[PDB]
Design a protein around this motif. Structure first.
Motif, PDB file in Angstrom:
ATOM      1  N   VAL A  40      46.192  27.815   8.750  1.00  0.00           N
ATOM      2  CA  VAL A  40      45.231  27.874   9.832  1.00  0.00           C
ATOM      3  C   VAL A  40      45.751  28.728  10.973  1.00  0.00           C
ATOM      4  O   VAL A  40      46.938  28.656  11.306  1.00  0.00           O
ATOM      5  CB  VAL A  40      44.965  26.450  10.389  1.00  0.00           C
ATOM      6  CG1 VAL A  40      44.158  26.448  11.678  1.00  0.00           C
ATOM      7  CG2 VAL A  40      44.313  25.541   9.363  1.00  0.00           C
ATOM      8  N   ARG A  41      44.898  29.501  11.615  1.00  0.00           N
ATOM      9  CA  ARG A  41      45.386  30.299  12.750  1.00  0.00           C
ATOM     10  C   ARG A  41      44.425  30.029  13.883  1.00  0.00           C
ATOM     11  O   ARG A  41      43.225  30.115  13.621  1.00  0.00           O
ATOM     12  CB  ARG A  41      45.431  31.765  12.392  1.00  0.00           C
ATOM     13  CG  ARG A  41      45.802  32.745  13.493  1.00  0.00           C
ATOM     14  CD  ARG A  41      46.067  34.106  12.874  1.00  0.00           C
ATOM     15  NE  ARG A  41      46.564  35.073  13.848  1.00  0.00           N
ATOM     16  CZ  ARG A  41      45.820  35.674  14.756  1.00  0.00           C
ATOM     17  NH1 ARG A  41      44.511  35.404  14.811  1.00  0.00           N
ATOM     18  NH2 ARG A  41      46.390  36.540  15.589  1.00  0.00           N
ATOM     19  N   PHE A  42      44.937  29.705  15.059  1.00  0.00           N
ATOM     20  CA  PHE A  42      44.065  29.465  16.193  1.00  0.00           C
ATOM     21  C   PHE A  42      44.184  30.717  17.059  1.00  0.00           C
ATOM     22  O   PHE A  42      45.277  31.252  16.975  1.00  0.00           O
ATOM     23  CB  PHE A  42      44.534  28.237  16.964  1.00  0.00           C
ATOM     24  CG  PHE A  42      44.533  26.992  16.134  1.00  0.00           C
ATOM     25  CD1 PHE A  42      45.725  26.469  15.642  1.00  0.00           C
ATOM     26  CD2 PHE A  42      43.346  26.322  15.900  1.00  0.00           C
ATOM     27  CE1 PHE A  42      45.721  25.291  14.919  1.00  0.00           C
ATOM     28  CE2 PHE A  42      43.341  25.129  15.195  1.00  0.00           C
ATOM     29  CZ  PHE A  42      44.514  24.636  14.682  1.00  0.00           C
ATOM     30  N   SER A  76      32.517  43.637   7.741  1.00  0.00           N
ATOM     31  CA  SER A  76      33.599  43.939   8.641  1.00  0.00           C
ATOM     32  C   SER A  76      34.997  43.494   8.276  1.00  0.00           C
ATOM     33  O   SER A  76      35.937  44.296   8.408  1.00  0.00           O
ATOM     34  CB  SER A  76      33.189  43.407  10.024  1.00  0.00           C
ATOM     35  OG  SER A  76      34.121  43.611  11.090  1.00  0.00           O
ATOM     36  N   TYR A  77      35.178  42.256   7.832  1.00  0.00           N
ATOM     37  CA  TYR A  77      36.532  41.784   7.550  1.00  0.00           C
ATOM     38  C   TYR A  77      37.204  42.566   6.426  1.00  0.00           C
ATOM     39  O   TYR A  77      38.363  42.943   6.583  1.00  0.00           O
ATOM     40  CB  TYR A  77      36.545  40.286   7.224  1.00  0.00           C
ATOM     41  CG  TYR A  77      36.145  39.494   8.462  1.00  0.00           C
ATOM     42  CD1 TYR A  77      37.058  38.711   9.162  1.00  0.00           C
ATOM     43  CD2 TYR A  77      34.818  39.517   8.875  1.00  0.00           C
ATOM     44  CE1 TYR A  77      36.613  37.982  10.247  1.00  0.00           C
ATOM     45  CE2 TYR A  77      34.372  38.829   9.968  1.00  0.00           C
ATOM     46  CZ  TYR A  77      35.301  38.065  10.670  1.00  0.00           C
ATOM     47  OH  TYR A  77      34.890  37.301  11.721  1.00  0.00           O
ATOM     48  N   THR A  78      36.525  42.825   5.339  1.00  0.00           N
ATOM     49  CA  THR A  78      37.058  43.621   4.237  1.00  0.00           C
ATOM     50  C   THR A  78      37.492  44.996   4.724  1.00  0.00           C
ATOM     51  O   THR A  78      38.611  45.437   4.506  1.00  0.00           O
ATOM     52  CB  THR A  78      35.929  43.866   3.203  1.00  0.00           C
ATOM     53  OG1 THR A  78      35.358  42.611   2.854  1.00  0.00           O
ATOM     54  CG2 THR A  78      36.425  44.542   1.943  1.00  0.00           C
ATOM     55  N   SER A 100      42.764  49.123   7.011  1.00  0.00           N
ATOM     56  CA  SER A 100      43.661  49.842   7.917  1.00  0.00           C
ATOM     57  C   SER A 100      44.687  48.890   8.505  1.00  0.00           C
ATOM     58  O   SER A 100      45.863  49.262   8.475  1.00  0.00           O
ATOM     59  CB  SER A 100      42.903  50.623   8.982  1.00  0.00           C
ATOM     60  OG  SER A 100      42.292  49.680   9.860  1.00  0.00           O
ATOM     61  N   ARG A 101      44.348  47.701   8.959  1.00  0.00           N
ATOM     62  CA  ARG A 101      45.321  46.800   9.549  1.00  0.00           C
ATOM     63  C   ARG A 101      46.481  46.491   8.593  1.00  0.00           C
ATOM     64  O   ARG A 101      47.653  46.447   8.967  1.00  0.00           O
ATOM     65  CB  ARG A 101      44.684  45.458   9.948  1.00  0.00           C
ATOM     66  CG  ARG A 101      45.660  44.639  10.809  1.00  0.00           C
ATOM     67  CD  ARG A 101      44.973  43.505  11.553  1.00  0.00           C
ATOM     68  NE  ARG A 101      44.474  42.457  10.653  1.00  0.00           N
ATOM     69  CZ  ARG A 101      45.243  41.464  10.173  1.00  0.00           C
ATOM     70  NH1 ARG A 101      46.545  41.298  10.459  1.00  0.00           N
ATOM     71  NH2 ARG A 101      44.659  40.581   9.382  1.00  0.00           N
ATOM     72  N   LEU A 102      46.149  46.170   7.348  1.00  0.00           N
ATOM     73  CA  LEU A 102      47.139  45.824   6.351  1.00  0.00           C
ATOM     74  C   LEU A 102      47.450  46.929   5.370  1.00  0.00           C
ATOM     75  O   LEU A 102      48.208  46.670   4.408  1.00  0.00           O
ATOM     76  CB  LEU A 102      46.724  44.538   5.624  1.00  0.00           C
ATOM     77  CG  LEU A 102      46.541  43.403   6.653  1.00  0.00           C
ATOM     78  CD1 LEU A 102      45.925  42.196   5.962  1.00  0.00           C
ATOM     79  CD2 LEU A 102      47.895  43.047   7.259  1.00  0.00           C
TER      80      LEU A 102
HETATM   81  C1  HEM Z   1      29.958  33.499  14.482  1.00  0.00           C
HETATM   82  C2  HEM Z   1      30.616  34.535  14.961  1.00  0.00           C
HETATM   83  C3  HEM Z   1      32.118  34.845  14.742  1.00  0.00           C
HETATM   84  C4  HEM Z   1      33.138  34.019  14.589  1.00  0.00           C
HETATM   85  C5  HEM Z   1      33.119  32.480  14.608  1.00  0.00           C
HETATM   86  C6  HEM Z   1      34.317  34.820  14.381  1.00  0.00           C
HETATM   87  C7  HEM Z   1      35.606  34.312  14.269  1.00  0.00           C
HETATM   88  C8  HEM Z   1      36.729  35.096  14.120  1.00  0.00           C
HETATM   89  C9  HEM Z   1      38.101  34.623  14.065  1.00  0.00           C
HETATM   90  C10 HEM Z   1      38.494  33.141  14.221  1.00  0.00           C
HETATM   91  C11 HEM Z   1      38.888  35.677  13.871  1.00  0.00           C
HETATM   92  C12 HEM Z   1      40.424  35.743  13.717  1.00  0.00           C
HETATM   93  C13 HEM Z   1      40.972  35.404  12.318  1.00  0.00           C
HETATM   94  C14 HEM Z   1      42.482  35.338  12.287  1.00  0.00           C
HETATM   95  O1  HEM Z   1      43.027  34.393  12.913  1.00  0.00           O
HETATM   96  O2  HEM Z   1      43.032  36.266  11.664  1.00  0.00           O
HETATM   97  C15 HEM Z   1      38.053  36.845  13.784  1.00  0.00           C
HETATM   98  C16 HEM Z   1      38.463  38.141  13.619  1.00  0.00           C
HETATM   99  C17 HEM Z   1      37.681  39.255  13.392  1.00  0.00           C
HETATM  100  N1  HEM Z   1      36.312  39.275  13.552  1.00  0.00           N
HETATM  101 FE1  HEM Z   1      35.133  37.648  13.578  1.00  0.00          FE
HETATM  102  N2  HEM Z   1      33.997  36.170  14.397  1.00  0.00           N
HETATM  103  C18 HEM Z   1      32.628  36.204  14.623  1.00  0.00           C
HETATM  104  C19 HEM Z   1      31.825  37.332  14.671  1.00  0.00           C
HETATM  105  C20 HEM Z   1      32.262  38.551  14.200  1.00  0.00           C
HETATM  106  C21 HEM Z   1      31.421  39.696  13.948  1.00  0.00           C
HETATM  107  C22 HEM Z   1      29.888  39.758  14.173  1.00  0.00           C
HETATM  108  C23 HEM Z   1      32.189  40.689  13.511  1.00  0.00           C
HETATM  109  C24 HEM Z   1      31.794  42.138  13.129  1.00  0.00           C
HETATM  110  C25 HEM Z   1      30.657  42.321  12.442  1.00  0.00           C
HETATM  111  C26 HEM Z   1      33.546  40.205  13.490  1.00  0.00           C
HETATM  112  C27 HEM Z   1      34.619  40.995  13.138  1.00  0.00           C
HETATM  113  C28 HEM Z   1      35.916  40.554  13.173  1.00  0.00           C
HETATM  114  C29 HEM Z   1      37.055  41.322  12.796  1.00  0.00           C
HETATM  115  C30 HEM Z   1      36.998  42.825  12.366  1.00  0.00           C
HETATM  116  C31 HEM Z   1      38.120  40.543  12.939  1.00  0.00           C
HETATM  117  C32 HEM Z   1      39.623  40.904  12.676  1.00  0.00           C
HETATM  118  C33 HEM Z   1      40.069  40.439  11.308  1.00  0.00           C
HETATM  119  C34 HEM Z   1      41.314  40.995  10.693  1.00  0.00           C
HETATM  120  O3  HEM Z   1      41.902  41.951  11.268  1.00  0.00           O
HETATM  121  O4  HEM Z   1      41.664  40.403   9.638  1.00  0.00           O
HETATM  122  N3  HEM Z   1      33.577  38.882  13.912  1.00  0.00           N
HETATM  123  N4  HEM Z   1      36.714  36.475  13.961  1.00  0.00           N
END
Ligand code: HEM
Ligand code: HEM
Ligand code: HEM
Lengths: 727, 309, 727, 83
Positions: free
Chosen positions: C138-140, C388-390, C395-397
């Protein structure tokens, strides 16, 4: 499912089989019991397949791997299809930058063992006992071409060996010629840009036959020695098994007393030295661009393991200045007549990789990877190499953790305070990431240099001089080694060199470049120079005819160890013979034929005008491996035509061409009974000709004759007669 | 210095010359008067060379480009040689990943002009006026082989055109046969892995003549149509100028009124259609693996400009 | 060298110990016996240190790790020093891009177990049996700030859980508030850019208190709901252990019969909900920017394992349109008064990582990583997240093989036909790299969907409509959720919300933006709007005063689940108390104090005006944890001052300030015997006041009273009294 | 090279020299500069060896290191004078 044929013929047998008898396979599937310490420690990342479910990389099983998720069966693909997106993403990111140079190469796993302990001259642990076996991973290559370029180009060949020792990885990164083209690493980009495809249009691929290469060579006479070797038949090896290997640079062996001995590294082919002829090599780049890569793979699958003897030329520290060339000058070879090669060990390549990309493409070799017992010298080419391989690997393999890529990992312990970096695999538990520390009691700890298992300490060479960007005056001699190389060649080897220069310079568009190259040749040897000149329609001047030849090298006017062929060393085991079938073959010739080849370990390929099978006179059913056009004479070492119904193939243009090509390329041809009617196609006198085996039938005398010819490799007395064969 | 010959025969004439007459050269030196809007906007990044000093990338002049800094002329190279490290570092990092597919390709600059306004069927600005000329950049390629593979292999050929329009870049990314091998993108990695060099040994380069390919074809009959095309002389074009080009997919044209028309895109070779025969094509991969790249470059240098409708 | 102390005090004991007692350490050294399947599977990459030789990455031992190789001890560094170059090279390339959002985070290992089978509603394997244990990581995190920004900023918190199931990884990527700021993923870059540091000067770090955020919020009223949550005490949680977690989006559960049920995911903190107050949080960003990270780690080292209950809001497919709000709108919550959270399971975090970079920094979580039994919905914010996550992870990893980085690997089987890519670890032996194939008999194979271990198949949702770039009209309602939230808060919570908006708007430089946000607050609630406007010297117009309040949400005029404190849920175990010492402490008081805290799992920190020891009245030697200035009142939950020689610290400014700060931040204070002379410092009447524990000694009910106060977290009744007070 | 993604970091706007820079380095990730020089190596005759080396001198000369005298053995050693 069940798509495999019910008879099991999709899977190759897990036992040694001859080239083309079975479908090739991943090494661990083809020879599961061929093992070594390196191969066994790779077992943690090996992945199977049979009986497993198809999944995403997160482990989710896939129900339908044929379709994207869409809104309706003729609708738009949906963004939520995470299975499609992971599959296409991984596919979209498959490629990594190829190697800057030596991008094209083929590799295999094997092992090394010394012939005796060498502790009197080096404390290197892998050289310390004849019972110490060291796993190796060897990659052979060309230089200029891309990873997709052809194998049988005219080129220097790389020969890189990664030794997985108990005291560290030692990479011996050499080539197949004993010197390099340039003296100082500062000129490497210039040289390499000159030989590579020209920058406006990126032509030509994998060839030195273009204006910028010869421009650089004409303006930099240090290159002439390696250029001589490249223009010889050394630049078109028959196989990676039949070529020599050299470290080139003078290095140092450090013994346990701390005595330094200058050494130059050598790989001697136990299969013997053997090269193609230019027309055959160039035609082979079009019929089989993978010829060498295929030959290596299939020699190993057949149990014809590539084996090389490791050899050292040893020169005492006090003899540094005893030659008439600088020992640190990488464009200078050390003639074996002056300093003999001491046979020190054997390396055997006995197992192919499982995945080409994971093991060969990602392998990273560095000449700077040495172990206690070895050290560098001031060779200005080697010095610059120490910086580059580490630097290029940061981008080629994406980060500073390339040593965690499975093929690159040491098999011995590695512990330090280095951390992080892209794609960090190792999870360190050390409380400390620095030293000195007290929190982990200073571990891991330094170790004093010593006789065995000690830390690395450089030999304390005395360094005296001003900081200067200067070429040593001792390196300024460029023609004596090229001349020595030239005089050591047989006449036909000489003729091949002339022909290599003439063909390459004919492709230089700017005529002045060809004239400046011929002028350089005139400083080497007038006969070489005139012969090249005559092919280019150039006339040597008055002044060029009187150029005084360079001095001999330490009294030598030749050295037979520089020739491929002066001293007979050929081996037929693993060579291949094409057998031209007819629809009613004399089955008694085939049996005599096949029995004899099989006793010498020579393989055969049964050829016909169509695939399927033919039936012998007695009714033997003979399976056809390929057609005449489909497996041309370029791919075999000799051609045998058994009797039977010759009228079936006597008017086959392909059959006649097969012999004319083999004839042109100096290969042994054997004709039994009515196969002797083919003599007219290659215009052979009624009394016969040396090089052509012919008898009423294919007995034992006939096969002994052919096998004798194969051991001599090619019929050099036929050169004068091939002028007059339209092929 | 005095390195170029006094007669100036090192430099190719800046004028249209036939194949083999002069050494080929960079386009803006070979044909300095040819221009288009795209070629003009590339001017701010073009770098010359004649009459300039040799420098590092930070603009420091270099005095000796033949040697590394060392402690004595026969000594060890020094770490402080920043000129050597910048030069070798840049050389060390010259490569980038080749394309996943179509890695082997040859390209050229040109222009496009519509014969008449198509505003009744499309509001695309670049087709809205016979006088409106659109700079293009076109890359022709094979499919399977690496960037260093041979040109005249048996292969489908790519024909990609980048249209620098006034309302955006339009890329028309097609091939030389009217259909593709497969129906759904999800199978692309399967088909391409099957056509590419088999994974254990990475053989064969640039050819479909091997087991995995025919294996895949035999199990997926949808591939037969493009296989037919590939097995015909269409798979071995004489030149990028004598091959047809197709966008393959049905796209849509949208006019100002919002009316949609289904469209399939075509390129017609104004030099006409022509191909090699197999034996000649395979032998040419050996004698001149750059034959199509060369032929395209030289036709343009000669003024035999490739033309397509 | 052998630098550790001979007493062995450089090494923390491998047993649970209270925060501050010992040096913290890598998880596997601190709790070697705390194991789970994922923790065990990482053993192949864990690297030790003790008793190993220091080497290069190639395994070569190092002798001198203190010096570069030079030509003379004062000479130039040599290019041939390959040890220096590998060491500096790895260091030079240690960094990787930080996450685009949520760059600052803190993570831990743990495990999950369901209370009962959920097979009736979902075929998800990790929920099918209460004895099935799933390892988690888990990561906060915060949202806006870099990896080096502070923990206690005002901000939404991320709460991402990686479930290593037997049928695949399932990542549950949520936040600490039940809704998000925006409705469609196309505006994520706009919202994020608005909240991140302004582009010209990259200020401010980790804060929404700046013009671009408030500009965006004032032009996009869909953000108000989550802005309310962020302005409340929800935005400054006391610890990751005392906050709620939510998936936000409506997803689907799919059972074996194919039935889809809508679900919203919740995590309930078993330690209860607790937040800081703004002044304390802000000050804590300076005194200890790593407060949350530290508290999480030390909680797990002490055995105070963070525990959360997984809960599901379940809604039948038939009730999709029965609410006032769209279920697929991520800016709308589902009131627990309408749809109760059904308890599903328990998650326990019981081990820290070994290496933060390797496990935390490279962990990749993705909401698209679901398993059979779960499915998506059309929520438009979720739909874009799946892309987005994929993408960002390439690039990050460093490439498409990030699933091979140890922390990210599935513990279950994964096999497919994907090959190569940068940093490829898996060496595939499958002869086939495509399907369908016959050469491996089509393995690995697709698997049909079924009740257990079947392939993934999406739920066949009907799709219907035109291709449009259009917000659903059902999403156009922005003020009733914000109003519901506002009315559900206690009065001191409402004031805190008003103070949050006021402070933040006060940092907006352009006054019209402040006016526009006030106008939006006026569409939610008049009391809120007026209070914020008054704090900004803004007057509402007559029209603003007459805006009609938005409707209730489905009849609800409040829902106490939305408050942090309306419904007590205090848990004291793992909290920490500061004990202010003097140089002759009544040891009787101390014994009473320490025992009582220990009995409730309440930690203590002994503070003084200097480090070292002090001696109690009976000669007990008391070890000092930190000074008054060094471990400020911001880092404890309560303050206890025992009797003794109070004159020792009576005039100590820091000691007095300590109480002033703790009193200002509503923390319980307990004064024993003469420690009551500190009452004057915080202006306490002679008769006393609720929130201040005072007695002649620390016996009787003194500790019970202080612990009752700790259970209610802070002394809200004291708010009016702190108004004044200069601290 | 990793921070800025390759060897062409001198071409990122803030990093570019405002004086002339010409050499035979080519390619690399995100190459901006389009070289027209027929040669990508020296010595070359096809571009008459341009761009050319420039001797060291009082102004606008090529870089030459100060010729400091170097005397000692190859050692990993701290100078005693640093102790
Ligand atoms: C319900 C809305 C959202 C929630 C609850 C959410 C939650 C999170 C969390 C908790 C993380 C960090 C994960 C970790 O600890 O590595 C994260 C990262 C990220 N979020 Fe989401 N996010 C939301 C919306 C979005 C949206 C709309 C996008 C883009 C379309 C997005 C793109 C990203 C990206 C690119 C990361 C970085 C991940 C990585 O580098 O692995 N997020 N988000
Ligand atoms: C005696 C002269 C040289 C020899 C024998 C030699 C040999 C080799 C070989 C055999 C390889 C291929 C290794 C493999 O199979 O991966 C190679 C690659 C390479 N060489 Fe050398 N080379 C020489 C000179 C140089 C110089 C002077 C430089 C630069 C100063 C250099 C830089 C490189 C680089 C950057 C690579 C690619 C490494 C990789 O990407 O892993 N080489 N060389
Ligand atoms: C109608 C069928 C297709 C046609 C006509 C086609 C055509 C092309 C062409 C002409 C190129 C080379 C572009 C250049 O010259 O740089 C190319 C490259 C590429 N193709 Fe397609 N292709 C097709 C199908 C696909 C599919 C289905 C995919 C994946 C789903 C795909 C992925 C790629 C990729 C990733 C590249 C490399 C692009 C780059 O690196 O810039 N192709 N394709």
């Amino acid at each position: 499912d069940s798509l495999a044929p019910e008879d099991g013929s999709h899977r190759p047998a897990a036992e040694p089989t001859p080239p083309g008898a079975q479908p090739t396979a991943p090494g661990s599937l083809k020879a599961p019991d061929t093992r070594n310490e390196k191969l066994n420690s790779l077992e943690d990342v090996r992945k199977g397949s049979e009986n497993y479910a198809l999944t995403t990389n997160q482990g989710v099983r896939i129900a339908d791997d044929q379709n994207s998720l869409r809104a309706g069966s003729r609708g738009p693909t949906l963004l939520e299809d995470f299975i499609l997106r992971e599959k296409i993403t991984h596919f979209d990111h498959e490629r990594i930058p190829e190697r800057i140079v030596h991008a094209r190469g083929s590799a295999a796993h094997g092992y090394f063992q010394p012939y005796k302990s060498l502790s009197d001259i080096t404390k290197a642990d892998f050289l310390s006992d004849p019972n110490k076996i060291t796993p190796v991973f060897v990659r052979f290559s060309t230089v200029q071409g891309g990873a997709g370029s052809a194998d049988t180009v005219r080129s220097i060949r790389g020969f890189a060996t990664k030794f997985y020792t108990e005291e560290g990885i030692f990479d011996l990164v050499g080539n197949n010629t004993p010197i390099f083209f340039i003296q100082d690493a500062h000129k490497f980009p210039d040289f390499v840009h000159a030989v590579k495809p020209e920058p406006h249009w990126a032509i030509p691929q994998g060839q030195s036959a273009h204006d910028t290469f010869w421009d650089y060579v004409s303006l930099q006479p240090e290159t002439l020695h390696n250029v001589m070797w490249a223009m010889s038949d050394r630049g078109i090896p028959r196989s990676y098994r039949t070529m020599e290997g050299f470290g080139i640079h003078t290095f140092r062996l450090i013994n346990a007393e701390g005595k330094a001995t200058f050494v130059r590294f050598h790989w001697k082919p136990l299969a013997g030295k053997a090269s193609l002829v230019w027309d055959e090599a160039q035609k082979l780049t079009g019929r089989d661009p993978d010829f060498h890569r295929r030959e290596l793979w299939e020699a190993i699958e057949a149990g014809d393991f590539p084996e090389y003897e490791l050899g050292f030329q040893l020169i005492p520290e006090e003899d540094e200045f005893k030659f008439d060339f600088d020992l640190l000058d990488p464009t200078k070879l050390i003639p074996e007549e002056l300093v003999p090669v001491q046979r020190v060990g054997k390396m055997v390549l006995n197992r192919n990789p499982d995945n080409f990309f994971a093991e060969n493409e990602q392998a990273a070799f560095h000449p700077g990877h040495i172990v206690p017992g070895l050290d560098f010298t001031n060779d200005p080419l080697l010095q610059g190499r120490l910086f580059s391989y580490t630097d290029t690997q940061i981008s080629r393999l994406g980060g500073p953790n390339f040593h965690e890529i499975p093929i690159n990992r040491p098999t011995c312990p590695y512990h330090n305070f280095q951390r992080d970096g892209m794609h960090r695999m190792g999870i360190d538990t050390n409380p400390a990431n620095y030293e000195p520390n007290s929190i982990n009691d200073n571990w891991p700890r330094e170790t004093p240099p010593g006789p065995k298992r000690g830390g690395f300490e450089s030999y304390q060479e005395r360094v005296e001089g001003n900081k200067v960007r200067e070429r040593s005056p001792s390196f300024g001699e460029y023609y004596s080694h090229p001349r020595l190389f030239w005089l050591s060649q047989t006449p036909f080897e000489q003729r091949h060199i002339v022909d290599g220069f003439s063909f390459e310079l004919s492709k230089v568009v700017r005529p002045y470049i060809r004239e400046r190259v011929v002028d350089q040749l005139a400083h080497i040897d007038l006969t070489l120079a005139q012969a090249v000149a005559k092919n280019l329609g150039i006339e040597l001047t008055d002044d060029q005819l009187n150029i005084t030849p360079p001095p001999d090298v330490n009294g030598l006017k030749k050295d037979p160890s520089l020739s491929l062929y002066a001293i007979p060393d050929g081996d037929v085991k693993g060579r291949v013979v094409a057998i031209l079938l007819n629809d009613e073959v004399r089955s008694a010739d085939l049996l005599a034929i096949l029995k004899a080849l099989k006793a010498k370990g020579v393989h055969a390929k049964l050829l016909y005008s169509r695939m399927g099978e033919v039936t012998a006179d007695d009714g033997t059913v003979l399976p056809i491996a390929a057609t005449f056009a489909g497996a041309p004479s370029l791919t075999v070492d000799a051609v045998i035509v058994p009797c039977g119904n010759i009228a079936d193939i006597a008017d086959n243009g392909d059959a006649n061409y097969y012999l004319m090509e083999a004839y042109k390329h100096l290969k042994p041809i054997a004709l039994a009974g009515d196969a002797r009617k083919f003599k007219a196609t290659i215009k052979i006198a009624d009394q016969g000709e040396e090089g052509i085996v012919e008898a009423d039938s294919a007995d034992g005398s006939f096969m002994d004759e052919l096998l004798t010819l194969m051991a001599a490799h090619r019929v050099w007395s036929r050169i004068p007669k091939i002028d007059k064969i339209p092929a």
